[PDB]
């Protein structure tokens, strides 16, 4: 109370409020995956239907940031709509400046610099949505930074954002993605997702499924729909 | 009296910024500790790695930033932040490589991003970056040179120096220690660097948890110690 | 009156403008710093005391050179020394280059003290929380100003500022004397720190630096040693 | 309340920031200026007397403005300093513009613009700086010139402002006589009204300036007392007090 | 005069440091050279407590934040 009000306003214990009270809006929302394979990075998002008038695909949650760059956003939904525009814009610019794809450690770190440059000012606010960044090429192989709304941003080999992030992160630990290939592990994928789901507060989820890897050719895309339905079938094989 | 806290360009009534110094607090919220020794003819760095995490990728938790070639840094302190800062101090540096064509002195360099922290602290239209920052480097005519450099705007040369939530422990370690004059060499600069961390945490420092950066005279290049050197050093440390 | 002790752009009901009396009070908590002006030579003279011996005394230098005859030495906060030196270095630049001639100190002082009111006059600029003492010789004749955070400037004989500042003028007015020179100065100087020193002042704890026609020279702590040898 | 900022009016209709800094011109030191047939001049009086403090420039409070103009300084030193340097430069603008000396109502209403500029846009505090002028013009002639903090100037032919100003002023009309002063006469009044202006007595010639406007060959020579024709005037103004207690 | 002391001990040392210091500072001072004493198991109070006592009370400054000074 009364160093919460505003983001350029550090706390007497030394700590910017707005910050946390952005990341608890990320909290609040559905649980997103991603799993680094052995050669590649598998994205799956939990996208609950909020009403059934919906289009079985509106306000999806996975954005290509590029053609081999893909982001799973996590939290609000407009300020993940334009923090996907923005790191396209940065690809593009990357690109254009450069020549070659932008590497997705220096992607997530510009666009995390661009994150972290909105809890710096108090007529602005920090962004209320987490997102993870996947991609896949043989020259550096496949990496998965996750960026909240702190703007720090470190690879990681299975991250989880949303509100039941622990349950996703305490069944991912016991996967052995160091090994295990780009197909199975999205069956896995979506295994995951159907455990860290409450079904009782939340009424329905239409389950989305993406990967970056070598068997989409360095290239980030929707996971196809004919094996998508297996990677469901698989979830349903669990009980939960 | 308690009413001053709220803007940065506002000074107490006995003369401070409170703003300033919760920035100050707000560098132990990283929970870490970092320690610079500096020898005859080396200067070591080291820092917690702390990975609370299996899935984490250790190679991307890293603190050590490497500025440019023969320019290293620790960043202690809120890790968005300090990845700010390190980018300014790149920049900094390119650009006065860029304009005057020798390499910038470390003094000098975050002696500008000391000016930049400055400014921010001063025109209220940022937060200060709460973020310390730690530099090494071997300059030519002056030997290894460590300084470390704050939020405030403070910059200054230490012989020896530390930064994080263990840090007035970890400077009285080393006021104990750099006060009987010996040979500062490389293996000795790591050991008392590493003895100075792992007392002022008193734990037993498993390799995986400590990373090292060092330049040298003989080698006037940022090198980060990997796991094989990291251990050869603890276990020449405990015999 | 607490309600106006925030804003910078207002007047108090008595019309005191309290944040730049905020700052003078900044500035006193201040390390310790005296200039005499003797009849050959100006001496300032500021104490730099580390918290540890883990600190590098000669990375920074609290005596700082603005011109070949002019210096700096301040007693407040230091990273707004900072800018404020180089500041006072570019606009002393800027005079040369214009008239082709070393800066003159009083001109240099005006034009540094305008720079200090320029950030007192604006909400959300902070005024420099540091008093500067700037020394000089110009006409061959020895000069010594002060430049305070609100933009005042005056031409201090002799003068201590920082912490005990009372005490190093109540140590002036008795051991100044107008007819000194430059030796004498520098040992004045280094008794007014010394009843505002705590500690056994070393060659690494004292900066100092004369200004006399020669030019504006910070003493090596060899000099400083043999100095204080002399007065010990 | 309702003194928050300068842009804020009173139900009343008062600027309360204006009030304000006029109210706080009286915290600065004696100023006068008396207006005579042959001349005009400027007494000042110095707060800062201090055996330590150097007197370099002896022009603390009256500032030179144009070959024809001088002003004397009461307020805040940093806004005192950003206002005659203002006026030094819209002076030498007129020089420059017109190839004129500046017909000294013109300086004024420039200054008084300004700060008006400033005591009305948001965001600026007003100057906190009351100043008096003095100058000789072809149009008419020696003036002397009274300016406020909120830019409301005036003709007058003798203030004071700073310290006790209301006793000096009632004083000065009490025994001002129009038309018949003389700058020897101007001089000894202006000594008068300072012996007990301010409360240091003897009125020590170290503490007070004087600088005197005439007119000779049309030259327009502005003179700065020293301290020899000041202590003359000190010991005369003595000799005077000490004949007219002769009468007791 | 009311503690044990020891001949070796020399108050006129510790009186011509120039740190100033109070008169709680003293007995601030002297109480921590007789802790100090006590907790070495010696009832005899020397130059070297005396010593580490002096240079403890007079560190004061704490943090002081290290750019007000």
Not at chain 2, 1 to 28: C, M, W
Not at chain 2, 52 to 62: A, G, H
Not at chain 3, 194 to 218: H, L, P, W, Y
Not at chain 4, 3 to 10: A, E, G, H, K, L
């Given at each position: 109370?009364?160093?919460?009000?505003?983001?350029?306003?550090?706390?007497?214990?030394?700590?910017?409020?707005?910050?946390?009270?952005?990341?608890?809006?990320?909290?609040?929302?559905?649980?997103?995956?991603?799993?680094?394979?052995?050669?590649?990075?598998?994205?799956?998002?939990?996208?609950?239907?909020?009403?059934?008038?919906?289009?079985?695909?509106?306000?999806?949650?996975?954005?290509?940031?590029?053609?081999?760059?893909?982001?799973?956003?996590?939290?609000?939904?407009?300020?993940?709509?334009?923090?996907?525009?923005?790191?396209?814009?940065?690809?593009?610019?990357?690109?254009?400046?450069?020549?070659?794809?932008?590497?997705?450690?220096?992607?997530?770190?510009?666009?995390?610099?661009?994150?972290?440059?909105?809890?710096?000012?108090?007529?602005?606010?920090?962004?209320?949505?987490?997102?993870?960044?996947?991609?896949?090429?043989?020259?550096?192989?496949?990496?998965?930074?996750?960026?909240?709304?702190?703007?720090?941003?470190?690879?990681?080999?299975?991250?989880?954002?949303?509100?039941?992030?622990?349950?996703?992160?305490?069944?991912?630990?016991?996967?052995?993605?160091?090994?295990?290939?780009?197909?199975?592990?999205?069956?896995?994928?979506?295994?995951?997702?159907?455990?860290?789901?409450?079904?009782?507060?939340?009424?329905?989820?239409?389950?989305?499924?993406?990967?970056?890897?070598?068997?989409?050719?360095?290239?980030?895309?929707?996971?196809?729909?004919?094996?998508?339905?297996?990677?469901?079938?698989?979830?349903?094989?669990?009980?939960? | 009296?308690?009413?001053?806290?709220?803007?940065?360009?506002?000074?107490?009534?006995?003369?401070?910024?409170?703003?300033?110094?919760?920035?100050?607090?707000?560098?132990?919220?990283?929970?870490?500790?970092?320690?610079?020794?500096?020898?005859?003819?080396?200067?070591?760095?080291?820092?917690?790695?702390?990975?609370?995490?299996?899935?984490?990728?250790?190679?991307?938790?890293?603190?050590?930033?490497?500025?440019?070639?023969?320019?290293?840094?620790?960043?202690?302190?809120?890790?968005?932040?300090?990845?700010?800062?390190?980018?300014?101090?790149?920049?900094?540096?390119?650009?006065?490589?860029?304009?005057?064509?020798?390499?910038?002195?470390?003094?000098?360099?975050?002696?500008?991003?000391?000016?930049?922290?400055?400014?921010?602290?001063?025109?209220?239209?940022?937060?200060?970056?709460?973020?310390?920052?730690?530099?090494?480097?071997?300059?030519?005519?002056?030997?290894?040179?460590?300084?470390?450099?704050?939020?405030?705007?403070?910059?200054?040369?230490?012989?020896?120096?530390?930064?994080?939530?263990?840090?007035?422990?970890?400077?009285?370690?080393?006021?104990?220690?750099?006060?009987?004059?010996?040979?500062?060499?490389?293996?000795?600069?790591?050991?008392?660097?590493?003895?100075?961390?792992?007392?002022?945490?008193?734990?037993?420092?498993?390799?995986?948890?400590?990373?090292?950066?060092?330049?040298?005279?003989?080698?006037?290049?940022?090198?980060?110690?990997?796991?094989?050197?990291?251990?050869?050093?603890?276990?020449?440390?405990?015999? | 009156?607490?309600?106006?002790?925030?804003?910078?752009?207002?007047?108090?009901?008595?019309?005191?403008?309290?944040?730049?009396?905020?700052?003078?009070?900044?500035?006193?908590?201040?390390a310790p710093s005296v200039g005499i002006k003797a009849?050959?030579?100006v001496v300032l003279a500021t104490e730099k005391?580390?918290?540890?011996?883990?600190?590098?005394?000669?990375?920074?230098?609290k005596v700082?050179?603005?011109?070949?005859?002019?210096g700096l030495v301040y007693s407040?906060?230091?990273?707004?020394?900072?800018?404020?030196?180089?500041?006072?270095?570019?606009?002393?630049?800027?005079?040369?280059?214009?008239?082709?001639?070393?800066?003159?100190?009083?001109?240099?002082?005006?034009?540094?003290?305008?720079?200090?009111?320029?950030?007192?006059?604006?909400?959300?600029?902070?005024?420099?929380?540091?008093?500067?003492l700037?020394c000089?010789?110009?006409?061959?004749?020895?000069?010594l100003?002060?430049?305070?955070?609100?933009?005042?400037?005056?031409?201090?004989?002799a003068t201590a500022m920082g912490?005990?500042?009372?005490?190093g003028?109540?140590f002036l007015?008795?051991?100044?004397?107008?007819?000194?020179?430059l030796?004498?100065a520098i040992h004045t100087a280094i008794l007014t720190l010394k009843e505002s020193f705590?500690?056994?002042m070393?060659?690494?704890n004292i900066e100092v630096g004369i200004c006399?026609?020669?030019?504006?020279?910070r003493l090596?702590?060899?000099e400083v040693?043999?100095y204080l040898?002399?007065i010990? | 309340?309702?003194?928050?900022?300068?842009?804020?009016?009173?139900?009343?209709?008062?600027?309360?920031?204006?009030?304000?800094?006029?109210?706080?011109?009286?915290?600065?030191?004696?100023?006068?200026?008396?207006?005579?047939?042959?001349?005009?001049?400027?007494?000042?009086?110095?707060?800062?007397?201090?055996?330590?403090?150097?007197?370099?420039?002896?022009?603390?409070?009256?500032?030179?403005?144009?070959?024809?103009?001088?002003?004397?300084?009461?307020?805040?030193?940093?806004?005192?300093?950003?206002?005659?340097?203002?006026?030094?430069?819209?002076?030498?603008?007129?020089?420059?513009?017109?190839?004129?000396?500046?017909?000294?109502?013109?300086?004024?209403?420039?200054?008084?613009?300004?700060?008006?500029?400033?005591?009305?846009?948001?965001?600026?505090?007003?100057?906190?700086?009351?100043?008096?002028?003095?100058?000789?013009?072809?149009?008419?002639?020696?003036?002397?010139?009274?300016?406020?903090?909120?830019?409301?100037?005036?003709?007058?032919?003798?203030?004071?402002?700073?310290?006790?100003?209301?006793?000096?002023?009632?004083?000065?009309?009490?025994?001002?006589?129009?038309?018949?002063?003389?700058?020897?006469?101007?001089?000894?009044?202006?000594?008068?009204?300072?012996?007990?202006?301010?409360?240091?007595?003897?009125?020590?010639?170290?503490?007070?300036?004087?600088?005197?406007?005439?007119?000779?060959?049309?030259?327009?020579?502005?003179?700065?007392?020293?301290?020899?024709?000041?202590?003359?005037?000190?010991?005369?103004?003595?000799?005077?007090?000490?004949?007219?207690?002769?009468?007791? | 005069?009311?503690?044990?002391?020891?001949?070796?001990?020399?108050?006129?040392?510790?009186?011509?440091?120039?740190?100033?210091?109070?008169?709680?500072?003293?007995?601030?001072?002297?109480?921590?050279?007789?802790?100090?004493?006590?907790?070495?198991?010696?009832?005899?109070?020397?130059?070297?407590?005396?010593?580490?006592?002096?240079?403890?009370?007079?560190?004061?400054?704490?943090?002081?934040?290290?750019?007000?000074?």
């Amino acid at each position: 109370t009364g160093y919460d009000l505003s983001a350029s306003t550090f706390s007497p214990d030394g700590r910017v409020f707005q910050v946390e009270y952005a990341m608890k809006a990320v909290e609040n929302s559905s649980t997103a995956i991603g799993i680094r394979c052995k050669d590649g990075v598998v994205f799956g998002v939990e996208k609950l239907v909020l009403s059934k008038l919906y289009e079985e695909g509106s306000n999806k949650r996975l954005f290509n940031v590029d053609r081999h760059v893909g982001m799973a956003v996590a939290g609000l939904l407009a300020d993940a709509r334009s923090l996907a525009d923005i790191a396209r814009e940065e690809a593009s610019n990357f690109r254009s400046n450069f020549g070659y794809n932008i590497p997705l450690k220096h992607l997530a770190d510009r666009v995390a610099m661009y994150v972290h440059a909105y809890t710096l000012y108090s007529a602005v606010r920090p962004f209320g949505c987490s997102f993870m960044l996947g991609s896949y090429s043989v020259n550096d192989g496949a990496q998965l930074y996750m960026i909240d709304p702190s703007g720090v941003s470190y690879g990681y080999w299975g991250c989880a954002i949303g509100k039941a992030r622990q349950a996703a992160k305490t069944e991912i630990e016991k996967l052995q993605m160091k090994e295990m290939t780009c197909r199975d592990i999205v069956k896995e994928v979506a295994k995951i997702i159907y455990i860290v789901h409450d079904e009782v507060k939340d009424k329905a989820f239409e389950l989305e499924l993406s990967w970056v890897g070598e068997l989409t050719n360095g290239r980030h895309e929707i996971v196809p729909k004919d094996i998508r339905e297996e990677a469901e079938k698989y979830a349903k094989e669990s009980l939960k | 009296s308690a009413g001053f806290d709220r803007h940065i360009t506002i000074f107490s009534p006995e003369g401070r910024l409170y703003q300033v110094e919760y920035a100050f607090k707000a560098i132990n919220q990283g929970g870490l500790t970092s320690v610079a020794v500096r020898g005859k003819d080396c200067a070591v760095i080291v820092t917690q790695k702390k990975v609370p995490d299996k899935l984490l990728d250790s190679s991307t938790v890293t603190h050590l930033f490497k500025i440019t070639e023969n320019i290293g840094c620790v960043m202690t302190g809120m890790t968005a932040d300090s990845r700010s800062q390190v980018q300014r101090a790149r920049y900094e540096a390119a650009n006065w490589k860029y304009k005057y064509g020798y390499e910038i002195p470390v003094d000098m360099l975050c002696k500008r991003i000391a000016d930049i922290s400055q400014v921010y602290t001063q025109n209220a239209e940022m937060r200060p970056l709460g973020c310390c920052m730690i530099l090494i480097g071997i300059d030519e005519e002056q030997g290894p040179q460590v300084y470390k450099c704050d939020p405030a705007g403070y910059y200054c040369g230490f012989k020896a120096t530390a930064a994080g939530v263990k840090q007035t422990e970890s400077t009285s370690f080393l006021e104990k220690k750099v006060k009987k004059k010996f040979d500062w060499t490389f293996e000795q600069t790591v050991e008392t660097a590493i003895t100075c961390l792992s007392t002022v945490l008193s734990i037993d420092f498993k390799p995986s948890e400590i990373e090292v950066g060092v330049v040298t005279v003989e080698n006037p290049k940022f090198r980060i110690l990997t796991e094989a050197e990291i251990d050869a050093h603890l276990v020449a440390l405990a015999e | 009156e607490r309600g106006y002790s925030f804003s910078l752009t207002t007047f108090s009901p008595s019309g005191k403008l309290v944040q730049i009396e905020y700052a003078l009070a900044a500035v006193a908590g201040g390390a310790p710093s005296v200039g005499i002006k003797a009849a050959n030579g100006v001496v300032l003279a500021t104490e730099k005391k580390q918290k540890s011996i883990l600190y590098d005394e000669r990375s920074v230098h609290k005596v700082e050179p603005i011109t070949k005859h002019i210096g700096l030495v301040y007693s407040g906060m230091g990273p707004d020394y900072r800018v404020l030196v180089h500041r006072a270095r570019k606009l002393a630049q800027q005079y040369y280059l214009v008239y082709q001639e070393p800066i003159p100190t009083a001109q240099l002082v005006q034009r540094v003290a305008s720079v200090m009111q320029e950030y007192t006059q604006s909400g959300g600029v902070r005024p420099f929380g540091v008093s500067l003492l700037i020394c000089g010789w110009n006409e061959g004749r020895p000069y010594l100003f002060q430049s305070d955070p609100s933009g005042a400037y005056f031409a201090w004989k002799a003068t201590a500022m920082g912490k005990n500042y009372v005490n190093g003028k109540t140590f002036l007015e008795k051991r100044y004397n107008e007819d000194l020179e430059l030796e004498d100065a520098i040992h004045t100087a280094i008794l007014t720190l010394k009843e505002s020193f705590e500690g056994q002042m070393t060659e690494d704890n004292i900066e100092v630096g004369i200004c006399n026609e020669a030019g504006f020279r910070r003493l090596t702590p060899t000099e400083v040693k043999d100095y204080l040898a002399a007065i010990a | 309340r309702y003194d928050s900022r300068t842009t804020i009016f009173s139900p009343e209709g008062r600027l309360y920031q204006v009030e304000y800094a006029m109210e706080a011109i009286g915290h600065a030191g004696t100023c006068l200026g008396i207006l005579a047939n042959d001349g005009v001049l400027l007494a000042a009086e110095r707060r800062n007397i201090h055996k330590l403090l150097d007197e370099v420039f002896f022009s603390e409070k009256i500032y030179k403005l144009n070959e024809d103009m001088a002003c004397s300084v009461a307020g805040i030193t940093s806004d005192a300093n950003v206002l005659t340097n203002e006026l030094r430069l819209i002076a030498q603008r007129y020089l420059l513009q017109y190839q004129e000396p500046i017909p000294c109502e013109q300086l004024v209403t420039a200054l008084c613009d300004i700060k008006q500029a400033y005591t009305q846009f948001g965001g600026k505090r007003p100057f906190g700086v009351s100043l008096l002028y003095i100058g000789w013009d072809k149009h008419y002639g020696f003036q002397l010139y009274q300016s406020d903090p909120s830019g409301n100037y005036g003709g007058w032919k003798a203030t004071c402002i700073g310290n006790n100003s209301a006793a000096a002023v009632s004083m000065l009309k009490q025994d001002y006589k129009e038309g018949e002063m003389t700058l020897k006469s101007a001089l000894a009044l202006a000594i008068k009204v300072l012996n007990k202006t301010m409360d240091v007595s003897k009125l020590s010639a170290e503490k007070v300036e004087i600088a005197t406007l005439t007119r000779e060959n049309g030259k327009t020579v502005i003179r700065v007392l020293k301290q020899k024709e000041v202590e003359q005037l000190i010991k005369k103004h003595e000799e005077e007090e000490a004949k007219a207690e002769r009468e007791k | 005069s009311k503690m044990n002391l020891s001949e070796e001990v020399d108050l006129e040392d510790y009186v011509a440091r120039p740190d100033k210091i109070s008169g709680a500072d003293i007995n601030s001072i002297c109480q921590e050279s007789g802790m100090l004493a006590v907790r070495e198991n010696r009832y005899i109070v020397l130059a070297k407590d005396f010593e580490k006592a002096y240079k403890t009370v007079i560190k004061k400054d704490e943090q002081e934040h290290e750019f007000y000074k």
